[PDB]
Tab-separated table of C-alpha atoms and ligand atoms in Angstrom:
chain	number	residue	atom	x	y	z
A	1	UNK	CA	-5.664	-45.268	-27.676
A	2	UNK	CA	-3.261	-42.280	-27.880
A	3	UNK	CA	-3.675	-39.662	-31.015
A	4	UNK	CA	-1.086	-37.321	-31.421
A	5	UNK	CA	-0.990	-33.775	-33.181
B	1	UNK	CA	-7.158	-38.710	-6.241
B	2	UNK	CA	-6.494	-34.979	-6.949
B	3	UNK	CA	-7.525	-32.582	-9.283
B	4	UNK	CA	-5.465	-29.462	-10.073
B	5	UNK	CA	-6.071	-25.874	-10.507
B	6	UNK	CA	-7.835	-24.843	-14.247
B	7	UNK	CA	-5.094	-22.940	-15.944
B	8	UNK	CA	-5.893	-20.899	-19.407
B	9	UNK	CA	-2.906	-21.696	-22.037
B	10	UNK	CA	-2.986	-20.518	-25.563
B	11	UNK	CA	-0.483	-22.964	-27.942
B	12	UNK	CA	0.624	-22.908	-31.512
B	13	UNK	CA	0.284	-25.539	-34.521
B	14	UNK	CA	3.772	-26.127	-35.898
B	15	UNK	CA	3.609	-26.254	-40.142
B	16	UNK	CA	5.330	-30.085	-39.828
B	17	UNK	CA	2.891	-31.601	-37.546
B	18	UNK	CA	0.042	-29.434	-35.500
B	19	UNK	CA	0.540	-28.286	-31.706
B	20	UNK	CA	2.922	-31.093	-31.147
B	21	UNK	CA	0.886	-32.752	-28.266
B	22	UNK	CA	-0.266	-36.256	-28.189
B	23	UNK	CA	-3.621	-36.926	-25.957
B	24	UNK	CA	-4.750	-39.837	-24.425
B	25	UNK	CA	-8.402	-41.052	-22.669
B	26	UNK	CA	-11.472	-40.429	-22.992
B	27	UNK	CA	-15.546	-40.210	-21.467
B	28	UNK	CA	-15.255	-43.664	-23.026
B	29	UNK	CA	-12.898	-44.820	-20.544
B	30	UNK	CA	-14.217	-42.772	-18.020
B	31	UNK	CA	-10.773	-41.018	-17.790
B	32	UNK	CA	-10.564	-37.365	-19.411
B	33	UNK	CA	-8.510	-36.096	-21.984
B	34	UNK	CA	-4.765	-35.948	-20.870
B	35	UNK	CA	-1.371	-34.679	-22.951
B	36	UNK	CA	0.889	-37.496	-23.036
B	37	UNK	CA	3.724	-36.223	-24.891
B	38	UNK	CA	4.946	-32.736	-25.811
B	39	UNK	CA	7.489	-32.304	-28.995
B	40	UNK	CA	10.538	-30.809	-28.273
B	41	UNK	CA	9.382	-27.836	-30.346
B	42	UNK	CA	6.813	-26.957	-28.330
B	43	UNK	CA	8.290	-28.277	-25.629
B	44	UNK	CA	10.614	-24.846	-24.691
B	45	UNK	CA	7.440	-22.421	-25.767
B	46	UNK	CA	4.867	-24.422	-23.141
B	47	UNK	CA	7.870	-24.737	-20.634
B	48	UNK	CA	5.929	-24.095	-17.111
B	49	UNK	CA	2.431	-23.724	-18.728
B	50	UNK	CA	1.241	-26.930	-20.265
B	51	UNK	CA	2.938	-30.398	-18.775
B	52	UNK	CA	2.251	-33.962	-19.257
B	53	UNK	CA	-0.678	-34.995	-17.050
B	54	UNK	CA	-2.568	-31.825	-17.925
B	55	UNK	CA	-6.362	-32.628	-18.510
B	56	UNK	CA	-7.688	-30.703	-20.876
B	57	UNK	CA	-11.365	-29.642	-20.053
B	58	UNK	CA	-11.864	-26.850	-22.478
B	59	UNK	CA	-11.073	-25.995	-25.847
B	60	UNK	CA	-11.537	-22.688	-26.663
B	61	UNK	CA	-14.212	-22.143	-24.586
B	62	UNK	CA	-15.643	-25.822	-25.816
B	63	UNK	CA	-16.108	-28.336	-22.576
B	64	UNK	CA	-14.492	-31.258	-24.065
B	65	UNK	CA	-14.394	-33.350	-20.340
B	66	UNK	CA	-18.100	-35.383	-21.185
B	67	UNK	CA	-16.715	-36.073	-24.588
B	68	UNK	CA	-15.091	-38.968	-26.313
B	69	UNK	CA	-11.423	-39.431	-28.173
B	70	UNK	CA	-11.848	-38.794	-31.124
B	71	UNK	CA	-14.525	-35.976	-31.034
B	72	UNK	CA	-11.848	-34.227	-28.930
B	73	UNK	CA	-8.614	-34.522	-31.702
B	74	UNK	CA	-11.824	-33.020	-34.557
B	75	UNK	CA	-11.753	-30.159	-32.670
B	76	UNK	CA	-7.861	-29.864	-32.167
B	77	UNK	CA	-7.758	-30.403	-35.967
B	78	UNK	CA	-10.418	-28.445	-37.162
B	79	UNK	CA	-9.111	-25.562	-35.152
B	80	UNK	CA	-7.062	-22.316	-36.695
B	81	UNK	CA	-2.773	-21.850	-36.099
B	82	UNK	CA	-3.972	-21.668	-32.180
B	83	UNK	CA	-6.016	-22.856	-29.544
B	84	UNK	CA	-6.368	-21.515	-26.253
B	85	UNK	CA	-6.555	-24.365	-23.466
B	86	UNK	CA	-8.086	-24.793	-19.949
B	87	UNK	CA	-6.305	-27.211	-18.200
B	88	UNK	CA	-6.023	-28.790	-14.968
B	89	UNK	CA	-3.261	-31.588	-13.307
B	90	UNK	CA	-4.549	-33.900	-12.546
B	91	UNK	CA	-2.265	-35.719	-9.703
B	92	UNK	CA	-2.206	-38.831	-7.333
B	93	UNK	CA	-1.666	-36.726	-3.892
B	94	UNK	CA	-3.126	-39.664	-1.760
B	95	UNK	CA	-0.311	-42.988	-0.965
B	96	UNK	CA	2.799	-43.309	0.124
B	97	UNK	CA	5.070	-46.441	-0.364
B	98	UNK	CA	6.366	-46.553	2.748
B	99	UNK	CA	3.632	-46.286	4.884
B	100	UNK	CA	2.017	-49.388	7.029
B	101	UNK	CA	-1.115	-49.076	6.819
B	102	UNK	CA	-2.559	-50.704	3.457
B	103	UNK	CA	-5.472	-49.150	1.320
B	104	UNK	CA	-8.243	-52.140	1.711
B	105	UNK	CA	-9.095	-53.448	-1.708
B	106	UNK	CA	-12.735	-54.444	-0.721
B	107	UNK	CA	-14.133	-51.434	0.767
B	108	UNK	CA	-17.348	-49.972	1.057
B	109	UNK	CA	-18.335	-46.885	3.478
B	110	UNK	CA	-21.438	-47.748	3.306
B	111	UNK	CA	-21.083	-51.332	4.850
B	112	UNK	CA	-18.298	-49.885	7.316
B	113	UNK	CA	-20.562	-47.729	8.816
B	114	UNK	CA	-23.223	-49.615	9.315
B	115	UNK	CA	-20.935	-52.288	11.227
B	116	UNK	CA	-19.414	-49.305	12.963
B	117	UNK	CA	-22.923	-48.191	14.331
B	118	UNK	CA	-23.770	-51.567	15.337
B	119	UNK	CA	-20.740	-52.028	17.326
B	120	UNK	CA	-21.517	-47.867	18.635
B	121	UNK	CA	-24.969	-49.429	19.617
B	122	UNK	CA	-23.980	-52.871	21.263
B	123	UNK	CA	-24.018	-52.516	25.039
B	124	UNK	CA	-20.163	-52.280	26.673
B	125	UNK	CA	-19.316	-50.523	23.088
B	126	UNK	CA	-17.639	-53.417	20.822
B	127	UNK	CA	-14.294	-51.239	20.926
B	128	UNK	CA	-12.735	-54.351	18.636
B	129	UNK	CA	-14.487	-54.121	15.753
B	130	UNK	CA	-14.469	-49.999	15.690
B	131	UNK	CA	-10.688	-50.889	16.196
B	132	UNK	CA	-10.031	-53.512	13.352
B	133	UNK	CA	-12.433	-51.136	10.875
B	134	UNK	CA	-10.910	-48.065	11.571
B	135	UNK	CA	-7.179	-48.934	11.696
B	136	UNK	CA	-7.261	-50.964	8.815
B	137	UNK	CA	-8.381	-48.275	6.311
B	138	UNK	CA	-6.536	-45.157	4.856
B	139	UNK	CA	-7.092	-41.466	5.549
B	140	UNK	CA	-9.319	-41.226	3.053
B	141	UNK	CA	-11.202	-43.916	3.375
B	142	UNK	CA	-12.180	-42.891	6.457
B	143	UNK	CA	-13.657	-39.408	5.174
B	144	UNK	CA	-15.707	-41.654	3.464
B	145	UNK	CA	-16.792	-43.580	6.485
B	146	UNK	CA	-17.331	-40.722	7.954
B	147	UNK	CA	-19.961	-39.300	4.971
B	148	UNK	CA	-21.475	-42.608	5.062
B	149	UNK	CA	-22.465	-42.204	9.101
B	150	UNK	CA	-23.602	-38.986	8.656
B	151	UNK	CA	-25.624	-40.093	5.775
B	152	UNK	CA	-26.881	-43.402	7.466
B	153	UNK	CA	-27.637	-41.578	10.912
B	154	UNK	CA	-27.763	-38.142	10.696
B	155	UNK	CA	-25.107	-37.914	13.699
B	156	UNK	CA	-21.114	-36.955	13.101
B	157	UNK	CA	-19.417	-40.185	13.510
B	158	UNK	CA	-16.541	-38.277	15.654
B	159	UNK	CA	-19.252	-37.446	18.106
B	160	UNK	CA	-20.671	-40.752	18.202
B	161	UNK	CA	-17.286	-42.263	18.504
B	162	UNK	CA	-16.276	-39.927	21.614
B	163	UNK	CA	-19.302	-41.157	23.395
B	164	UNK	CA	-18.131	-44.526	22.972
B	165	UNK	CA	-14.938	-44.722	23.388
B	166	UNK	CA	-12.000	-43.553	26.530
B	167	UNK	CA	-8.643	-43.245	27.686
B	168	UNK	CA	-6.219	-43.544	25.066
B	169	UNK	CA	-7.813	-45.354	22.710
B	170	UNK	CA	-10.242	-42.360	22.231
B	171	UNK	CA	-7.406	-40.003	21.379
B	172	UNK	CA	-5.820	-42.378	18.630
B	173	UNK	CA	-9.284	-43.194	17.039
B	174	UNK	CA	-10.550	-39.755	17.016
B	175	UNK	CA	-7.263	-38.902	16.101
B	176	UNK	CA	-6.903	-40.970	12.785
B	177	UNK	CA	-10.586	-39.466	11.647
B	178	UNK	CA	-9.381	-36.487	11.137
B	179	UNK	CA	-6.896	-35.363	7.262
B	180	UNK	CA	-3.711	-34.787	8.212
B	181	UNK	CA	-3.756	-31.315	7.802
B	182	UNK	CA	-6.641	-31.228	10.007
B	183	UNK	CA	-4.692	-33.076	12.611
B	184	UNK	CA	-1.013	-31.381	12.150
B	185	UNK	CA	-3.565	-28.055	12.482
B	186	UNK	CA	-5.053	-29.117	15.925
B	187	UNK	CA	-2.132	-30.766	17.390
B	188	UNK	CA	-0.281	-26.984	16.376
B	189	UNK	CA	-3.119	-25.581	18.428
B	190	UNK	CA	-2.956	-27.530	21.443
B	191	UNK	CA	0.877	-27.194	21.880
B	192	UNK	CA	0.089	-23.584	21.888
B	193	UNK	CA	-3.043	-23.132	23.238
B	194	UNK	CA	-3.176	-21.673	27.459
B	195	UNK	CA	-0.417	-19.317	29.075
B	196	UNK	CA	2.683	-22.128	28.230
B	197	UNK	CA	3.977	-23.900	24.830
B	198	UNK	CA	5.016	-27.521	24.519
B	199	UNK	CA	7.736	-26.777	22.332
B	200	UNK	CA	8.485	-30.328	21.908
B	201	UNK	CA	5.331	-30.682	20.006
B	202	UNK	CA	5.418	-28.022	17.971
B	203	UNK	CA	9.201	-28.291	16.534
B	204	UNK	CA	8.210	-32.016	15.880
B	205	UNK	CA	5.492	-30.865	13.736
B	206	UNK	CA	7.399	-27.803	12.071
B	207	UNK	CA	10.812	-29.400	11.538
B	208	UNK	CA	9.433	-32.569	9.701
B	209	UNK	CA	6.779	-31.738	7.534
B	210	UNK	CA	7.360	-30.692	3.930
B	211	UNK	CA	6.451	-27.574	1.854
B	212	UNK	CA	3.361	-29.222	0.273
B	213	UNK	CA	2.553	-30.715	4.329
B	214	UNK	CA	2.828	-26.986	5.685
B	215	UNK	CA	0.677	-25.570	2.536
B	216	UNK	CA	-2.392	-27.027	3.926
B	217	UNK	CA	-1.259	-27.071	7.086
B	218	UNK	CA	-1.318	-23.458	6.856
B	219	UNK	CA	-4.550	-23.182	4.827
B	220	UNK	CA	-6.671	-25.409	7.447
B	221	UNK	CA	-5.343	-23.733	10.517
B	222	UNK	CA	-6.798	-20.011	9.283
B	223	UNK	CA	-9.905	-21.973	8.241
B	224	UNK	CA	-10.574	-23.820	11.891
B	225	UNK	CA	-9.138	-21.462	14.267
B	226	UNK	CA	-9.458	-18.044	12.155
B	227	UNK	CA	-5.916	-17.182	12.974
B	228	UNK	CA	-2.907	-17.322	11.201
B	229	UNK	CA	-0.409	-20.013	12.347
B	230	UNK	CA	2.480	-17.444	11.663
B	231	UNK	CA	0.561	-15.713	14.274
B	232	UNK	CA	-0.126	-17.674	16.991
B	233	UNK	CA	3.484	-19.134	16.672
B	234	UNK	CA	4.943	-15.733	17.097
B	235	UNK	CA	2.662	-14.935	20.366
B	236	UNK	CA	3.895	-18.690	21.604
B	237	UNK	CA	7.675	-17.588	21.051
B	238	UNK	CA	10.101	-15.524	21.326
B	239	UNK	CA	14.308	-14.141	20.313
B	240	UNK	CA	15.863	-16.253	17.958
B	241	UNK	CA	13.332	-19.648	18.454
B	242	UNK	CA	10.750	-17.761	17.071
B	243	UNK	CA	12.856	-17.193	13.729
B	244	UNK	CA	13.854	-20.401	13.307
B	245	UNK	CA	10.202	-21.603	13.992
B	246	UNK	CA	8.466	-19.052	11.891
B	247	UNK	CA	11.294	-19.551	9.343
B	248	UNK	CA	10.386	-23.086	9.112
B	249	UNK	CA	6.368	-22.514	9.460
B	250	UNK	CA	5.773	-21.425	5.741
B	251	UNK	CA	6.386	-24.152	3.768
B	252	UNK	CA	8.992	-21.909	0.915
B	253	UNK	CA	11.996	-24.127	1.209
B	254	UNK	CA	13.842	-24.021	-2.205
B	255	UNK	CA	12.841	-27.634	-4.394
B	256	UNK	CA	15.902	-29.784	-5.186
B	257	UNK	CA	17.290	-28.929	-8.079
B	258	UNK	CA	18.192	-30.888	-10.803
B	259	UNK	CA	22.176	-30.095	-10.701
B	260	UNK	CA	24.189	-30.969	-7.828
B	261	UNK	CA	25.626	-27.723	-7.316
B	262	UNK	CA	29.141	-28.281	-5.679
B	263	UNK	CA	30.252	-24.773	-5.576
B	264	UNK	CA	27.354	-23.772	-3.251
B	265	UNK	CA	27.455	-27.139	-0.575
B	266	UNK	CA	31.159	-26.648	-0.117
B	267	UNK	CA	30.517	-22.437	0.116
B	268	UNK	CA	26.897	-23.142	2.797
B	269	UNK	CA	29.361	-25.655	4.592
B	270	UNK	CA	32.117	-23.555	5.285
B	271	UNK	CA	29.854	-20.658	5.794
B	272	UNK	CA	28.137	-22.924	9.013
B	273	UNK	CA	31.352	-23.686	10.092
B	274	UNK	CA	32.572	-19.448	9.975
B	275	UNK	CA	29.420	-19.226	11.412
B	276	UNK	CA	29.514	-21.446	14.867
B	277	UNK	CA	32.177	-23.368	15.576
B	278	UNK	CA	35.507	-21.074	14.354
B	279	UNK	CA	34.222	-18.037	15.922
B	280	UNK	CA	33.869	-17.101	19.169
B	281	UNK	CA	29.745	-17.193	19.629
B	282	UNK	CA	27.969	-18.103	16.749
B	283	UNK	CA	25.922	-16.149	13.556
B	284	UNK	CA	22.556	-17.586	14.196
B	285	UNK	CA	20.724	-15.577	11.009
B	286	UNK	CA	23.057	-17.662	9.022
B	287	UNK	CA	22.506	-20.938	10.491
B	288	UNK	CA	18.671	-19.799	10.220
B	289	UNK	CA	19.068	-19.051	6.403
B	290	UNK	CA	20.787	-22.124	5.505
B	291	UNK	CA	19.090	-24.776	7.051
B	292	UNK	CA	15.881	-23.017	6.154
B	293	UNK	CA	16.003	-21.934	2.646
B	294	UNK	CA	17.985	-24.967	1.108
B	295	UNK	CA	16.556	-28.239	-0.122
B	296	UNK	CA	16.963	-30.995	1.823
B	297	UNK	CA	18.962	-33.106	-0.931
B	298	UNK	CA	21.370	-30.185	-0.978
B	299	UNK	CA	21.837	-29.901	2.768
B	300	UNK	CA	22.218	-33.882	3.400
B	301	UNK	CA	25.627	-33.005	1.126
B	302	UNK	CA	26.482	-29.843	2.957
B	303	UNK	CA	25.986	-31.801	6.593
B	304	UNK	CA	28.737	-34.690	5.335
B	305	UNK	CA	30.407	-31.221	3.280
B	306	UNK	CA	30.979	-29.905	6.534
B	307	UNK	CA	32.401	-32.736	8.510
B	308	UNK	CA	35.646	-31.750	6.099
B	309	UNK	CA	35.635	-28.140	7.913
B	310	UNK	CA	34.424	-28.886	11.396
B	311	UNK	CA	36.130	-31.983	14.125
B	312	UNK	CA	32.641	-32.169	15.223
B	313	UNK	CA	29.290	-32.639	12.815
B	314	UNK	CA	26.218	-30.511	12.390
B	315	UNK	CA	24.889	-32.153	15.417
B	316	UNK	CA	27.930	-31.405	17.944
B	317	UNK	CA	28.086	-28.086	17.049
B	318	UNK	CA	25.025	-27.590	17.332
B	319	UNK	CA	24.902	-28.928	20.928
B	320	UNK	CA	28.921	-26.679	21.980
B	321	UNK	CA	27.136	-23.110	20.216
B	322	UNK	CA	22.911	-22.879	21.106
B	323	UNK	CA	21.317	-23.904	24.422
B	324	UNK	CA	17.944	-24.115	25.219
B	325	UNK	CA	14.766	-23.969	22.927
B	326	UNK	CA	16.980	-22.794	19.790
B	327	UNK	CA	19.204	-25.955	20.562
B	328	UNK	CA	16.534	-28.545	20.473
B	329	UNK	CA	14.825	-26.636	17.629
B	330	UNK	CA	18.348	-26.991	14.992
B	331	UNK	CA	18.595	-30.667	16.814
B	332	UNK	CA	15.703	-31.429	15.679
B	333	UNK	CA	15.503	-30.016	12.261
B	334	UNK	CA	19.132	-31.726	11.459
B	335	UNK	CA	17.402	-35.096	12.418
B	336	UNK	CA	14.489	-34.441	9.502
B	337	UNK	CA	17.136	-33.555	6.913
B	338	UNK	CA	19.955	-36.131	7.698
B	339	UNK	CA	17.739	-39.118	8.311
B	340	UNK	CA	13.766	-37.937	8.560
B	341	UNK	CA	12.717	-42.259	10.175
B	342	UNK	CA	15.331	-42.395	12.330
B	343	UNK	CA	14.672	-39.233	13.784
B	344	UNK	CA	10.997	-40.747	14.358
B	345	UNK	CA	12.258	-44.175	15.916
B	346	UNK	CA	13.742	-42.384	18.577
B	347	UNK	CA	11.337	-40.152	19.532
B	348	UNK	CA	9.262	-43.098	19.906
B	349	UNK	CA	12.001	-44.962	22.100
B	350	UNK	CA	11.904	-42.103	24.196
B	351	UNK	CA	8.195	-41.961	24.619
B	352	UNK	CA	8.485	-45.244	25.603
B	353	UNK	CA	11.933	-46.187	27.299
B	354	UNK	CA	11.146	-44.322	31.222
B	355	UNK	CA	8.342	-45.315	33.398
B	356	UNK	CA	5.179	-45.024	32.365
B	357	UNK	CA	4.608	-43.526	28.012
B	358	UNK	CA	4.219	-39.835	26.824
B	359	UNK	CA	1.733	-40.841	24.984
B	360	UNK	CA	0.827	-37.405	23.496
B	361	UNK	CA	4.115	-38.289	21.393
B	362	UNK	CA	3.730	-41.789	20.891
B	363	UNK	CA	-0.361	-41.301	19.172
B	364	UNK	CA	0.526	-38.090	16.985
B	365	UNK	CA	3.559	-40.490	15.763
B	366	UNK	CA	1.622	-43.565	14.861
B	367	UNK	CA	-1.008	-41.810	13.400
B	368	UNK	CA	0.575	-39.046	11.521
B	369	UNK	CA	3.243	-41.125	10.012
B	370	UNK	CA	1.223	-44.531	9.755
B	371	UNK	CA	0.905	-43.914	6.082
B	372	UNK	CA	4.053	-41.922	5.270
B	373	UNK	CA	7.625	-43.996	6.290
B	374	UNK	CA	6.129	-45.888	9.041
B	375	UNK	CA	7.867	-48.704	6.968
B	376	UNK	CA	11.317	-46.589	7.599
B	377	UNK	CA	10.780	-46.089	11.144
B	378	UNK	CA	10.251	-49.424	11.752
B	379	UNK	CA	13.475	-51.019	10.099
B	380	UNK	CA	15.816	-48.530	11.600
B	381	UNK	CA	14.032	-48.535	14.875
B	382	UNK	CA	15.241	-52.630	14.852
B	383	UNK	CA	18.149	-51.874	13.508
B	384	UNK	CA	19.499	-49.150	16.082
B	385	UNK	CA	17.369	-50.943	19.302
B	386	UNK	CA	17.456	-54.418	18.579
B	387	UNK	CA	13.950	-55.055	18.934
B	388	UNK	CA	10.680	-53.847	17.149
B	389	UNK	CA	8.862	-50.956	17.196
B	390	UNK	CA	6.110	-53.522	17.811
B	391	UNK	CA	7.805	-55.041	20.653
B	392	UNK	CA	7.976	-51.617	22.527
B	393	UNK	CA	4.492	-50.911	21.760
B	394	UNK	CA	3.270	-53.934	23.179
B	395	UNK	CA	5.702	-53.911	26.573
B	396	UNK	CA	4.498	-49.848	27.340
B	397	UNK	CA	0.240	-50.488	26.062
B	398	UNK	CA	-2.420	-52.684	27.415
B	399	UNK	CA	-6.108	-53.166	25.750
B	400	UNK	CA	-7.631	-52.028	23.210
B	401	UNK	CA	-5.400	-48.614	22.707
B	402	UNK	CA	-2.737	-51.340	22.360
B	403	UNK	CA	-4.299	-53.709	19.686
B	404	UNK	CA	-4.933	-50.058	17.830
B	405	UNK	CA	-1.382	-48.761	17.663
B	406	UNK	CA	0.086	-52.181	16.971
B	407	UNK	CA	-2.326	-52.233	14.094
B	408	UNK	CA	-0.891	-48.769	13.380
B	409	UNK	CA	2.708	-50.390	13.389
B	410	UNK	CA	1.578	-53.260	11.017
B	411	UNK	CA	3.855	-55.401	12.332
B	412	UNK	CA	6.403	-57.164	14.226
B	413	UNK	CA	10.231	-55.686	13.097
C	501	LIG	CA1	-16.799	-53.419	25.988
C	502	LIG	CA1	0.452	-20.399	25.182
C	503	LIG	CA1	31.244	-20.488	18.686
C	504	LIG	CA1	7.644	-47.153	29.262
């Protein structure tokens, strides 16, 4: 997946 | 397949949102955690320090390489307002879209090593099996076969193949076994070893290699021969020919900028005109400085703008201005800038057009360019000369040596 900060 | 050098970068957390970086990957997918997106706020702050593609291997000294995706997220979550990142750029250095040698999909280095070993062991040597394998494997795959051979036989693959192969076939196979930098460096030392110089080969390599290629060339040349390439070039050349070669061999040419500097394209074109055709004699350093330092896409437009100031193009002007090794050097350099595949198609035709074959040039172009731009070399060899590069190799060579070259060619037309 892809987490964002 | 390439992992860059490690770098330490300190970032900061925004009030709205967080650090402004999106990440993806993890130990679940057997891939590292990589920054995917950088926000416009932290874009200007991290310009040149962190880029999309950097693999975050350490966070504040904590090794997050063998960690999962959400495990790395929670470390960035529970951090302070700043985080020091140890990053390494993941790139894809191997590969080219215009090479004729395709990667073998069912690749197994242990099986290919055994099949070659049994081909060497067969009485009379089964060169056909060795050629059909090594010519249909990428260079990265060949290095794996060499490691698997020495693992199974306790003997080096290149030394055993020299004892099994002879003639021009041996030269082709042994050349495919060296890495591009190894092969280019070995061909450079051959052009300078002895009391003479093969300027045709020294010019072909230095004028056509790019910055990235020349960087690794200079590295392995010092590793294999314990001498910098610039020293041996200085010892084997002189005059302005030495100046042009030493400068080109640095690999410090400008990267192609994001803008088309029209003012510099016209000024460079007029500078080349005033430095040669317009005046008596030639300002050789001015020609050297412009054609060596500017980028290739810039010089392509410069040479077209030069046709606006001079009634002769850069090639014709070079012939009328300079002679000898300097003229030949400049002529090869402009060809590489204008149309490098056409440059190689022309050299391939010259290696086979007359009596016999200049095998030194035919082999090197087929080995060094099989995984770079051979498809483009072929499309213009056919276009200019009317017949295929396959056709000329077919008419000029025979035996298993012909079969290997036709494999590196990759097809008819
Ligand atoms: Ca045989
Ligand atoms: Ca010499
Ligand atoms: Ca002149
Ligand atoms: Ca011939």
